[PDB]
Protein backbone atom coordinates (compact mmCIF):
# COMPACT_ATOMS: atom_id res chain seq x y z
CA UNK A 1 0.00 0.00 0.00
CA UNK A 2 0.94 3.67 -0.20
CA UNK A 3 3.00 5.49 2.41
CA UNK A 4 -0.21 7.18 3.53
CA UNK A 5 -2.93 5.22 5.36
CA UNK A 6 -0.48 2.70 6.87
CA UNK A 7 -2.19 0.42 9.40
CA UNK A 8 0.09 -1.84 11.48
CA UNK A 9 1.58 -1.38 14.85
CA UNK A 10 4.33 1.29 14.74
CA UNK A 11 6.17 -0.91 17.25
CA UNK A 12 8.39 -3.50 15.60
CA UNK A 13 7.56 -7.07 16.54
CA UNK A 14 10.18 -9.17 18.30
CA UNK A 15 10.23 -11.46 15.25
CA UNK A 16 11.03 -8.50 13.00
CA UNK A 17 13.77 -7.42 15.40
CA UNK A 18 15.29 -10.91 15.50
CA UNK A 19 15.24 -11.43 11.74
CA UNK A 20 16.51 -7.94 10.91
CA UNK A 21 19.34 -8.34 13.43
CA UNK A 22 20.30 -11.72 11.98
CA UNK A 23 20.23 -10.41 8.42
CA UNK A 24 22.22 -7.28 9.27
CA UNK A 25 24.76 -9.34 11.21
CA UNK A 26 25.18 -11.69 8.25
CA UNK A 27 25.64 -8.73 5.90
CA UNK A 28 28.20 -7.15 8.24
CA UNK A 29 30.08 -10.46 8.53
CA UNK A 30 30.09 -10.57 4.72
CA UNK A 31 32.06 -7.27 4.40
CA UNK A 32 29.05 -4.94 4.08
CA UNK A 33 29.83 -1.36 5.17
CA UNK A 34 28.95 -0.67 8.80
CA UNK A 35 26.60 2.22 9.52
CA UNK A 36 27.27 3.07 13.18
CA UNK A 37 30.88 3.65 14.21
CA UNK A 38 32.51 0.65 15.87
CA UNK A 39 34.73 0.92 18.96
CA UNK A 40 36.87 -2.21 18.66
CA UNK A 41 33.89 -4.41 17.78
CA UNK A 42 35.00 -7.54 15.91
CA UNK A 43 31.73 -9.43 16.44
CA UNK A 44 29.12 -8.65 13.75
CA UNK A 45 26.21 -9.40 16.10
CA UNK A 46 27.09 -6.64 18.57
CA UNK A 47 27.75 -4.34 15.61
CA UNK A 48 24.25 -5.03 14.30
CA UNK A 49 22.78 -4.45 17.77
CA UNK A 50 24.57 -1.11 18.03
CA UNK A 51 23.31 -0.24 14.54
CA UNK A 52 19.76 -1.04 15.64
CA UNK A 53 20.09 1.11 18.76
CA UNK A 54 21.19 3.99 16.50
CA UNK A 55 18.37 3.28 13.99
CA UNK A 56 20.92 3.14 11.16
CA UNK A 57 20.12 -0.30 9.71
CA UNK A 58 19.52 0.17 5.94
CA UNK A 59 16.61 -2.28 5.76
CA UNK A 60 12.89 -1.77 5.14
CA UNK A 61 10.46 -4.41 6.40
CA UNK A 62 7.75 -5.48 3.95
CA UNK A 63 4.77 -6.39 6.15
CA UNK A 64 2.44 -8.61 4.13
CA UNK A 65 -1.22 -8.12 4.96
CA UNK A 66 -3.49 -11.20 4.86
CA UNK A 67 -5.37 -9.81 1.83
CA UNK A 68 -2.23 -9.90 -0.35
CA UNK A 69 -1.21 -6.26 0.01
CA UNK A 70 2.00 -5.19 1.74
CA UNK A 71 3.41 -2.22 3.64
CA UNK A 72 7.02 -1.04 3.76
CA UNK A 73 8.42 0.01 7.15
CA UNK A 74 12.02 1.10 7.52
CA UNK A 75 13.74 0.03 10.72
CA UNK A 76 14.24 3.71 11.53
CA UNK A 77 10.51 4.34 11.02
CA UNK A 78 9.67 1.50 13.41
CA UNK A 79 10.31 2.38 17.05
CA UNK A 80 12.54 -0.04 18.94
CA UNK A 81 10.95 -2.19 21.64
CA UNK A 82 14.07 -1.81 23.80
Amino acid sequence: QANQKRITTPYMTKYERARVLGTRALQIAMCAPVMVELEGETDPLLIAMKELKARKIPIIIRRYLPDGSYEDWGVDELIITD
Binding site: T9, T13, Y15, T81
Partner: protein, 48 residues
Protein backbone atom coordinates in the same frame (compact mmCIF):
# COMPACT_ATOMS: atom_id res chain seq x y z
CA UNK B 1 -2.58 11.25 46.98
CA UNK B 2 -0.52 11.31 43.78
CA UNK B 3 1.11 14.54 42.63
CA UNK B 4 0.70 16.06 39.19
CA UNK B 5 4.15 15.11 37.89
CA UNK B 6 3.74 11.63 39.39
CA UNK B 7 0.35 11.37 37.68
CA UNK B 8 1.85 12.34 34.31
CA UNK B 9 4.61 9.76 34.73
CA UNK B 10 2.00 7.15 35.68
CA UNK B 11 0.00 7.92 32.53
CA UNK B 12 3.15 7.57 30.44
CA UNK B 13 4.01 4.24 32.04
CA UNK B 14 0.45 2.97 31.56
CA UNK B 15 0.56 3.84 27.87
CA UNK B 16 4.00 2.27 27.37
CA UNK B 17 3.18 -0.95 29.24
CA UNK B 18 -0.18 -1.40 27.52
CA UNK B 19 1.48 -0.88 24.13
CA UNK B 20 4.11 -3.46 25.11
CA UNK B 21 1.41 -5.95 26.13
CA UNK B 22 -0.19 -5.91 22.66
CA UNK B 23 0.29 -9.22 20.87
CA UNK B 24 3.01 -9.01 18.25
CA UNK B 25 1.75 -9.64 14.70
CA UNK B 26 3.40 -12.77 13.36
CA UNK B 27 3.14 -14.63 16.68
CA UNK B 28 2.24 -18.29 16.21
CA UNK B 29 -0.78 -18.33 18.49
CA UNK B 30 -2.25 -21.68 17.40
CA UNK B 31 0.74 -23.83 18.34
CA UNK B 32 1.28 -21.81 21.51
CA UNK B 33 -2.32 -22.35 22.62
CA UNK B 34 -2.20 -26.05 21.72
CA UNK B 35 0.95 -26.54 23.81
CA UNK B 36 -0.40 -24.44 26.69
CA UNK B 37 -3.42 -26.75 26.64
CA UNK B 38 -1.55 -30.05 26.29
CA UNK B 39 1.07 -29.30 28.94
CA UNK B 40 -1.35 -29.40 31.94
CA UNK B 41 -2.80 -32.64 30.54
CA UNK B 42 0.50 -34.34 31.41
CA UNK B 43 0.10 -33.44 35.10
CA UNK B 44 -3.62 -34.33 35.06
CA UNK B 45 -4.78 -37.62 36.55
CA UNK B 46 -6.32 -40.24 34.26
CA UNK B 47 -8.83 -41.24 36.96
CA UNK B 48 -11.87 -39.34 38.20
Amino acid sequence: RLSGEAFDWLLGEIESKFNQAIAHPGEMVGALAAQSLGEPATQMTLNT
